[PDB]
Write a protein that binds this ligand. Structure first.
Ligand SMILES: Cc1cc2nc3c(=O)[nH]c(=O)nc-3n(C[C@H](O)[C@H](O)[C@H](O)COP(=O)(O)OP(=O)(O)OC[C@H]3O[C@@H](n4cnc5c(N)ncnc54)[C@H](O)[C@@H]3O)c2cc1C
Ligand SMILES: Cc1cc2nc3c(=O)[nH]c(=O)nc-3n(C[C@H](O)[C@H](O)[C@H](O)COP(=O)(O)OP(=O)(O)OC[C@H]3O[C@@H](n4cnc5c(N)ncnc54)[C@H](O)[C@@H]3O)c2cc1C
Lengths: 649, 649
């Protein structure tokens, strides 16, 4: 009963697309099991303002990500590098996966991030068509309400970019080699050409723009809707309430509220998978040809290990009765970003400061994401690729936001009350984040929301009684995240001083200065950078360098004092992935090593995170997997003018 | 059963002509379905005074347009721009469509209105013969009883026209470029040549005349009859009570009281249409070659959308099970006019004021339509075509009427009791009205009288915290209808002062002044126009200009105070159309885009409303469609001396 040539686990960001383009482009019987259910008529999801809690009950006013009925609750172990706290990250449960609860921003990643870090047969020129297909299928829209702050910021970054171009340094964070001598920045003219950060040819690596492309749409009424995988690939036009396909998709048979705990094996090939229905009773599903797993970043290692594939020593220590294959790499090598935050306050006359921040309110067409640029490398960064003098990378993503987005305790401590209406927010984050972790299960019975999740982000360095030059490379490798965070702070400071001069030039007689990071510290950091140079981070370890000069010890105190911001004055970005990268757990065909008929086709099978937000990465993976499993480039050849018909239901 | 090569939906203003000239000029079997029935022996329709209710029952004294047994009841949504009211507009149901309940006035439109706004292959030189055919087939007659007021008005407009000609301004509302230096105004001589506003060569764009051409006739008895499509194209000479043609029209088979809710399709071509008879039971009609739809302005979008052609997202939201084609333009871009009204009272001796308004009573040969001119553009109008310095357009239509035609509440508030016999009426209306709307269905089951009809006419402008010169074009575009209404008021004021001086010159020692619009406001508006000039409308938004001078704030108060007249002191003219303009829903052959064998040939398929009343536009469309569907210019070549024989039965 309930057989299937291809069995798909989870209707995540790639599961829905895989099921759709697999049922349509073939004639086999396909069955999909998803833990969540459709939310097509849920006002909290469809309305973009539901992210801010416009439909919450009065006595249960919690966020959608913190609701265990919408997402997995992945509580993590205490963090040695984050002052011994236990933050909780979530994965959206339901059709579309984590695209039901995100902030609806799309980035493609770039050209170099796929050209260098990815293995052969996987570069940008092979996934360009899949990326374009995904983007046109989503069909995003830019921001509609334009503000005066954005033009001033654009001209400021333009001035900084032209100064850096005239400088002659090898690489900086406003240098786009593929463009040329002309700075890669948008124009402040009201009739400027809208510059895109997702160009089809990948010519824009680091560049300043005016807006991103939200995953929203405007309806005939005037209401805005949320566009994501669920309402783009698996609407009512294809699957009914009985979970059956119609038309040429009749081979698909999707089952909702179905979580699968284990894949049954015959020793080296899969024969069936079992799930538990809403009755609380178990069920059996028989697999014919292959098994597809789309369980997301944090939870494909668990389903792989619990099913019998993984480190046999630790699995035996846990108590796994049935063992299949032994790799010491299952679940290791996952990556995630981190977003330090800064707050800038404007001082002046009330009218001028009220007019300066015009057109900033949270709107469904932007969700507060005005955005500035995807910045690159710092001039003082020690940890840079060897071939940096040949290509330009992506390291930072500068985005502007209204209000003061900071944890409440830090808001009270710093005094930045949201009642103040003369301040805004800009965020610089790291997309090539260094620190790494691991996931291990604790019980081989059922997939639980809390496995052993060790993630230490900003660790320190303990000097030893060894020669300094012998140990310095180790310290440089270890202290990368703090270096990146402080370089981001310096970049924000340069952008801010350019903002001040440009705003004074543009007729607004106001001044913008940093207040949140205790500007004394930031100004001292800038002075120390200028007076020291490439060896600025040597004083991160005070007793190792042993300068013992008042300037040197004061800089050591400043560096130790400023390390608290990157650790506590931010919130962790939920872009985890790449826990089963190609070569570690799967080959270049996304098939498991040593196994015969199991395939994994989500973000968990990514070699390295992209140079941007990873919405399109998962779907793209699925798209590629569609033609890898079918055997012909059916999906990649389809013309650009073919999008699934969007049904609101 | 009941097959047909050509199936015609509705015997509207164009349906009857289409059926007649299609059955006569071909040999195919034609079947016509109409929701109404013949009213050839109904005294309310035939008698022109039936419009004023001369045959109403004592306990059901309602107008013919407000009777749901004669017309559709198109109640509209609340109007933000009209103080939140819900006026109801109607479409005449029966043979001839809305020509059974209209006021029987014919205008051709002009030369420029077809030369500029219409696409290629559709200009005036291509539809001149169709227009002449329609006019000679109707064979209208002018007014018979001439009054003294008309000559005085004609000489007043002549004086104003010669002054404007001597002025040298680029364009005004008594400047006809095609005529020359001599003013385009009729002569006050008793033996003057009757000037026509429907000249075959289209040389009269803006010109003053003495009367229009009513759609009436005088019978041998002396009784007057109503001439319209029903008694001009589908009399007893062609179709009997069994709905069968006779003679060379025997291929036609018309069915009355037949409303069609949906056109059945085979995927891209129509195969049949279904209707419901007077028994209340359904029926099936099979289509052979093409389907013709003539359902009128408000109701062709509904029949198009409900049949499966239109915006698939909104149709799916409604619940349309069968879907055909997807356009975001079905039902959008419709136009209608609006007629502001003014009342003038004469003060003097009772004998002189009784003699001044001689020959004004409502007569079937004029129906109170003495009329003055089709006026043009104002000198202070900001919204004018770029090429206005090359051609002359039509914007206003000045017509005189007896009594006080104004809603009863406003009559009581202003005190203009109809018991007063020293006042008359003149109407200036906009034929190029700016505000636009949309129609959307709410149930995909049956054509209902009340779909979602959003029509906001006179909207306001809300200033923002932005530079004034940056936003001024937006305000100018938005505030067009109020500008046009106040310019019409100023035109009426100039005509009125010329009337006063000319009447004082012509031996009548009386004075004519405006009373209804609270003449203080009109005189202040004239003074403000004179003292300000082209930037008179800048004070429509008081805080944006920020003059804050007693004259300026007083003018702002006057402009805000005078905006109530155009909103409430009038009634909406029922000349809606152009909801499926060429290029939006149909091509230049009036055929639906993407469909194979469906054609629409009524006013709904008009690119832009004409520069006049749209009686002849629909029929003309049909005429053109006759030779488009047959393939040869059969109808357009027929000599001028061929009219269908008029049977009273
Ligand atoms: C607050 C927030 C904001 C974000 N903003 C952005 C943004 O602006 N841009 C961006 O690119 N990304 C953003 N993200 C991240 C983005 O939502 C996802 O990280 C991205 O879609 C990649 O993850 P995924 O969809 O592959 O994982 P998912 O597909 O979401 O992984 C979980 C899925 O697997 C299924 N599943 C898992 N285990 C099982 C099981 N045992 N049985 C059955 N089904 C199972 C679940 O039902 C669910 O469908 C944001 C995330 C959060 C939390
Ligand atoms: C009070 C009043 C005064 C007017 N005065 C003038 C004037 O002086 N001059 C002027 O030019 N115009 C005037 N008009 C407008 C004029 O009557 C029409 O607007 C003009 O004929 C253009 O509309 P139409 O005939 O194409 O629409 P119509 O043909 O009248 O549209 C409705 C027709 O379609 C048919 N129909 C619709 N839906 C269906 C269906 N589902 N099944 C079957 N049949 C269907 C109806 O039976 C009817 O025959 C006036 C209108 C009104 C209300």
């Amino acid at each position: 009963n309930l057989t299937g040539d291809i069995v798909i686990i989870g209707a995540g960001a790639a599961g829905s697309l895989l099921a759709h383009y697999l049922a349509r482009f073939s004639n086999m019987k396909i069955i999909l099991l998803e833990a969540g259910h459709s939310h097509f008529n849920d006002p909290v999801v469809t309305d973009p303002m539901g992210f801010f809690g416009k439909y919450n009950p009065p006595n249960e006013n919690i966020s959608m990500s913190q609701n265990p009925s919408y997402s997995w609750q992945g509580a993590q172990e205490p963090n040695t590098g984050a002052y011994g706290n236990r933050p909780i990250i979530a994965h959206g449960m339901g059709f579309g996966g984590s695209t039901m609860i995100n902030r609806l921003n799309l980035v493609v990643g770039g050209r170099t991030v796929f050209d260098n870090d990815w293995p052969v047969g996987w570069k940008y020129d092979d996934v360009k068509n899949y990326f374009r297909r995904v983007l046109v299928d989503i069909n995003p829209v830019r921001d509609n309400t334009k503000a005066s702050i954005t033009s001033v910021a654009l001209d400021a970054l333009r001035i900084i970019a032209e100064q850096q171009i005239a400088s002659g340094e090898p690489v900086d964070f406003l240098l786009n080699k593929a463009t040329g001598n002309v700075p890669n920045v948008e124009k402040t003219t009201p009739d400027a050409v809208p510059l895109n950060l997702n160009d089809y040819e990948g010519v824009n690596s680091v560049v300043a723009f005016s807006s991103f492309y939200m995953g929203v749409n405007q309806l005939s009424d005037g209401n805005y809707i949320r566009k994501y995988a669920g309402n783009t690939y698996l609407n009512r036009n294809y699957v009914d309430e009985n979970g059956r396909g119609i038309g040429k998709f009749s081979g698909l048979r999707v089952v909702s509220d179905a979580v699968v705990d284990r894949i049954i094996f015959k020793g080296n090939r899969a024969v069936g998978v079992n799930y538990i229905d809403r009755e609380g009773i178990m069920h059996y599903v028989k697999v014919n040809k292959e098994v597809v797993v789309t369980s997301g970043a944090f939870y494909t290692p668990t389903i792989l290990q619990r099913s019998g594939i993984g480190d046999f020593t630790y699995l035996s220590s846990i108590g796994v009765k049935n063992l299949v294959y032994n790799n010491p790499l299952v679940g290791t090598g996952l990556k995630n970003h981190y977003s330090p935050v800064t707050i800038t306050r404007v001082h002046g006359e009330p009218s001028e400061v009220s007019r300066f921040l015009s057109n900033m309110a949270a709107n469904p067409t932007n969700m507060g994401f005005k955005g500035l640029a995807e910045l690159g490398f710092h001039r003082l960064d020690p940890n840079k690729p060897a071939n940096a003098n040949t290509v330009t990378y992506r390291k930072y993503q500068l985005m502007m936001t209204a209000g003061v987005g900071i944890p409440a305790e830090q808001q009270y401590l710093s005094g930045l009350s949201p009642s103040s209406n003369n301040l805004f927010t800009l965020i610089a984050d790291d997309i090539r984040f260094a620190p790494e972790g691991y996931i291990k299960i604790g019980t081989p019975n059922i997939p639980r929301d809390v496995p052993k999740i060790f993630f230490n982000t900003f660790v320190t360095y303990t000097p030893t009684s060894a020669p300094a030059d012998q140990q310095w490379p180790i310290a440089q490798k270890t202290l990368a995240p703090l270096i990146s965070a402080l370089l981001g702070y310096d970049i924000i400071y340069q952008t801010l001083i350019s903002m001040n001069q440009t705003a004074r030039d543009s007729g607004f007689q106001v001044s913008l200065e940093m207040v949140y990071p205790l500007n004394d510290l930031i100004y001292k950091l800038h002075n120390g950078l200028a007076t020291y140079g490439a060896n600025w981070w040597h004083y991160f370890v005070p007793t190792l360098v042993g300068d013992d000069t008042p300037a040197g010890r004061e800089f050591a105190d400043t560096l130790s004092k400023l390390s608290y911001y990157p650790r506590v004055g931010a919130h962790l970005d939920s872009h985890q992935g790449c826990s089963c990268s190609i070569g570690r757990t799967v080959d270049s065909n996304l098939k498991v090593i040593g196994t015969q008929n199991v395939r994994v086709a989500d973000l968990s099978a990514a070699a390295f995170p992209p140079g941007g937000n990873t919405w399109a990465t998962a779907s793209m993976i699925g798209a590629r997997a569609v033609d890898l499993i079918l055997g012909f480039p059916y999906l990649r050849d389809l013309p650009v003018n073919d999008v699934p018909i969007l049904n609101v239901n």
